[PDB]
Amino acid sequence: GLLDXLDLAS
Amino acid sequence: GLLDXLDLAS
Amino acid sequence: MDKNELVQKAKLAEQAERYDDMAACMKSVTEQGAELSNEERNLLSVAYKNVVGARRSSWRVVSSIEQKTEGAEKKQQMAREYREKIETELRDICNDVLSLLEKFLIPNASQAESKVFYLKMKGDYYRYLAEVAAGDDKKGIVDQSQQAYQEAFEISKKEMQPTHPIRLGLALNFSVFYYEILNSPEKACSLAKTAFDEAIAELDTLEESYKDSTLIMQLLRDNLTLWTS
Amino acid sequence: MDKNELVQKAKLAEQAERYDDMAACMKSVTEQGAELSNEERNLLSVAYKNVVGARRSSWRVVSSIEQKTEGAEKKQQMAREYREKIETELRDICNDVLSLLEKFLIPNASQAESKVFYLKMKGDYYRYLAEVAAGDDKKGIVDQSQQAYQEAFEISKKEMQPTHPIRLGLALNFSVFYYEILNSPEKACSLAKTAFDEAIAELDTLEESYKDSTLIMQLLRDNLTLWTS
């Protein structure tokens, strides 16, 4: 959800 | 796999 | 580009999930006039299956929205417009495939198994054109789909074992055409049932791969179960 | 169309999974010159994340293949040419975004959160360009990525709480930049550990919504764990 747009590099 | 190609309408 | 080259690119495009690219390769391959190997036939179908399926999935999403916006004449107008833009993409793809089927694939098929595969594909693609047609165009398209499936069916009954996955998968898709497209549940249930039963009966007599066959037999019966109640 | 129409079309393309379309809508909106609201900033990111991520994905697959192709130089050749084509799509995309960022998104950002968000994004995108550069330009592209992240990092240290997700996500991505791109695990580990520890200390101090924050904290700690042994 929110973390999606944040384009995390995980 | 094989069934994927057959494009089944399921 | 060389034919072997075109195939190898198609295979990279598949690994990459670049289906539009994959379909362009297999289109060029087909256009060279020679009969497809089974491997080529499968690549062609994998590629068009994913290219047409993405547009069908999007047409269903935007069609829903359109039909579910009561009022908001503008919002609704924009949806109808996006839908039409998607339909156009989708008729172009079906027209490409149907043209490949008429010009090369079908007339070049030298085995019944391939001819049944391609005739069914023709039925499938006209069925997709049907789902998204209005006016009196529908009837005309619906009929082309029916005739392609029917020709396939008659060949498969004459030439193939009742357990052959392509005969069974044709039965499945033709039965869904009748139910979902011609609104003839009784013709649908009767085609699915016969197809299931003949296959069960061939087992009694009886090497080949029944795993895939039995899967499609399960799908026939799940549909009977759902069409019954 | 007007801003509202574009925004609406964008949400429709999202529903349809037509990301190239979504990006193009949100590009025009951005090009109207006015500071984007959170709903618009978010749509723009979603769109480009998917548009770029697909080509990164495809690049990694093909590039890999081009690597294990020690057999037929021929095949290897095709894999290189396919890769090159895809890098080109990829560079176009990063360049569109990097430009939307320099001309509009950074200069018009009136609030710390948004400004950190767009500087992080700038870092992300130069970083994606470094991944496929060599060897000449690489050094300088790496430097632009690092300058962005650093600048973002300084602002977030002065203006945002350590548990803020934009701050922690900057830390996550910046730390991975140090590890994967500058090959510098001491700097990666330190940034990540500090960022985790400072968010932990703000928990003692104390709202608002720590579920997202704690998921990014977990991702930071999972990286330290990996990077130790």
- Among D177, D113, D184, smallest CA distance to D142 is for D177
Q: How many CB atoms lie within 10 A of CB D89?
A: 15
Q: Residue C39: is the preceding peptide bond cis (ω within 30°)?
A: no
Pairwise CA distance, residues C219 & C225, whole Å: 10
Inspect the interface and report whether the beta carbons of B5 and C124 lie closer than 8 Å: no
Q: C45: which residues sit within 8 A by CB, 6+ positions away?
A: B5, B7, C121
Residue C127 and residue C177 in contact, taking contact as beta carbons nearer than 8 Å: yes
- Do chains A and D meet with 3 or more Cβ pairs nearer than 8 Å? yes
- Among D150, D149, D152, smallest CA distance to D123 is for D149
Inspect the interface and report whether the beta carbons of C212 and B8 lie closer than 8 Å: no
Q: A9: which residues sit within 8 A by CB, 6+ positions away?
A: D124, D172, D173, D176, D177
C-alpha distance from C182 to closest chain D C-alpha (Å): 27
Residue C87 tokens, joined:
């339909």
C-alpha distance from B2 to closest chain C C-alpha (Å): 8
Inspect the interface and report whether the beta carbons of B8 and C173 lie closer than 8 Å: yes
Inspect the interface and report whether the beta carbons of A6 and D169 lie closer than 8 Å: yes
Q: How many CB atoms lie within 10 A of CB D153?
A: 19
Q: C223: which residues sit within 8 A by CB, 6+ positions away?
A: C172, C175, C176, C179, C188, C192
- Among D157, D158, D163, smallest CA distance to D202 is for D163
Q: How many helices (H) and strands (E) does chain B have?
A: 1, 0
Inspect the interface and report whether the beta carbons of D12 and C58 lie closer than 8 Å: no
- Among D167, D162, D90, smallest CA distance to D128 is for D90
Q: Which of D124, D177, D215 sits opposite A7 (nearest CB)?
A: D124
Inspect the interface and report whether the beta carbons of C17 and D58 lie closer than 8 Å: yes
Inspect the interface and report whether the beta carbons of A9 and D166 lie closer than 8 Å: no
Pairwise CA distance, residues C131 & C79, whole Å: 18
- Do chains D and C meet with 3 or more Cβ pairs nearer than 8 Å? yes
C-alpha distance from A3 to closest chain D C-alpha (Å): 7
Residue C171 tokens, joined:
């039965």
Helix (H) or strand (E) run with residue D146 in it: helix D138-159
Pairwise CA distance, residues B3 & C214, whole Å: 11
Pairwise CA distance, residues C92 & C148, whole Å: 20
Residue C227 tokens, joined:
């069409």
Inspect the interface and report whether the beta carbons of C169 and B8 lie closer than 8 Å: yes
Inspect the interface and report whether the beta carbons of D212 and A2 lie closer than 8 Å: yes
Residue C47 tokens, joined:
């590629």
Residue D199 and residue D152 in contact, taking contact as beta carbons nearer than 8 Å: no
C-alpha distance from D42 to closest chain A C-alpha (Å): 6
Cβ contacts from C onto D, under 8 A: 50
- Do chains A and B meet with 3 or more Cβ pairs nearer than 8 Å? no
A9 backbone dihedrals φ, ψ, rounded to 5°: -85, -10
Inspect the interface and report whether the beta carbons of D86 and C15 lie closer than 8 Å: no
Inspect the interface and report whether the beta carbons of B6 and C169 lie closer than 8 Å: yes
- Among C24, C17, C102, smallest CA distance to C54 is for C17
Pairwise CA distance, residues D104 & D119, whole Å: 12
3-state DSSP call for residue D112? helix
Q: C171: which residues sit within 8 A by CB, 6+ positions away?
A: C153, C191, C192, C195, C220
* Selected residue of C22, C50, C58, C69 to mutate for chain D interface (largest D Cβ count, 10 A): C58
Which experimental method was this entry solved with?
X-ray
Residue D119 tokens, joined:
């500087």
Residue D55, by phi and psi: left (phi above 0), alpha (psi -120 to 50) or beta?
alpha
C-alpha distance from A2 to closest chain D C-alpha (Å): 8
Helix (H) or strand (E) run with residue D182 in it: none
Q: Which of C12, C54, C65 sits opposite D12 (nearest CB)?
A: C65
Pairwise CA distance, residues D214 & D201, whole Å: 13
* Beta-carbon-side half-sphere exposure of residue D148 (alpha carbons within 13 Å): 26
Burial C7-27 (b: 16+ CB within 10 A, else e): bbbbbbbbebebbebbbbbbb
Domain that holds residue D110: 1-229
* DSSP letter (8 states) at residue D106: T
Q: Where are the alpha helices (DSSP H) in D101-132?
A: 112-130
Residue D213 tokens, joined:
């924050």
List of chain D residues whose C-beta atoms are within 8 Å of the C-beta of residue A8 = 169, 172-173, 216, 219
Q: Which of A5, A8, A9 sits opposite D46 (nearest CB)?
A: A5
Domain count, chain D: 1
By CB atoms closer than 10 A (0-12, 13-18, 19+), residue D118 is buried
Using the structure block, give the residue that is written with the tokens 């697909």.
Answer: D54
Pairwise CA distance, residues D188 & D223, whole Å: 9
3-state secondary structure chain C: CCHHHHHHHHHHHHHCCCHHHHHHHHHHHHCCCCCCCHHHHHHHHHHHHHHHHHHHHHHHHHHHHHHHCCCCHHHHHHHHHHHHHHHHHHHHHHHHHHHHHHHHHHHHCCCHHHHHHHHHHHHHHHHHHHHCCCCCHHHHHHHHHHHHHHHHHHHHHHHCCCCCHHHHHHHHHHHHHHHHHCCCHHHHHHHHHHHHHHHHHHHHHCCCCHHHHHHHHHHHHHHHHHHHC
Residue D173 and residue D116 in contact, taking contact as beta carbons nearer than 8 Å: no
Q: Which residue of D has its CA nearest to C63?
A: D16
Pairwise CA distance, residues D79 & C229, whole Å: 53
Pairwise CA distance, residues D98 & D109, whole Å: 15
Q: C155: which residues sit within 8 A by CB, 6+ positions away?
A: C112, C115, C116, C119
Q: What CATH number is given to the structural domain containing D38? A: 1.20.190.20
C-alpha distance from C82 to closest chain B C-alpha (Å): 25
Inspect the interface and report whether the beta carbons of B5 and C42 lie closer than 8 Å: yes
